[PDB]
Amino acid sequence: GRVTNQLQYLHKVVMKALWKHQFAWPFRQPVDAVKLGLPDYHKIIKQPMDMGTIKRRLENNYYWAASECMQDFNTMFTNCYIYNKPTDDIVLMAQTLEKIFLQKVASMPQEEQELVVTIP
């Protein structure tokens, strides 16, 4: 991947705010459906995603475009809404975190530019 202004913003602003939030703990690591006794989790959820995985990807310059990282955040929230019951508190926690995600994304740099200054 590469380092861009937008991906650096996603790492140092958006992820920093979401990771520390009081509602982040269910999303800081992949769902362990074996330990949770949930044999249907991976039958229903085709693309598991979590903030621990996203954070490691950002640390390792896995992404090529901010939009890919935004899709990973979105998949994580969508998985929660699809799998759980509409009245479960975790749905409310995801809605709270996703609202912060969108609020912070609103102030991301407009044009994606690689943060490299190279010598030919």
Ligand X SMILES: CC[C@@H]1C(=O)N(C)c2cnc(Nc3ccc(C(=O)N[C@H]4CC[C@@H](N5CCN(CC6CC6)CC5)CC4)cc3OC)nc2N1C(C)C
Q: Phi first, then psi: what are they for 107, rounded to 5°?
A: -105, 15
Nearer Cβ to ligand X (10/93): 93
**Residue pair 109/67 in contact by the 8 Å Cβ criterion:** no
Per the DSSP assignment, residues forming a β-bridge with 4 are: 114
Binding residue for ligand X, selected from 58, 70, 80, 93, defined by CB under 6 A: 80
C-alpha–C-alpha distance, residues 109 and 98, integer Å:
19
Query: Which residues in 39-58 contact ligand X (CB under 6 A)?
Result: 41
Binding residue for ligand X, selected from 1, 23, 24, 26, defined by CB under 6 A: 26
List C-alpha distances in Å: 8 to 11, 20, 72, 74, 106.
Answer: 5, 17, 15, 18, 15
Binding residue for ligand X, selected from 67, 74, 84, 103, defined by CB under 6 A: 84
- Whole-number minimum distance, CB 85 to ligand X, in Å? 9
Binding site for ligand X (CB under 6 A): 26-27, 31, 36, 38, 41, 80, 83-84, 88, 90
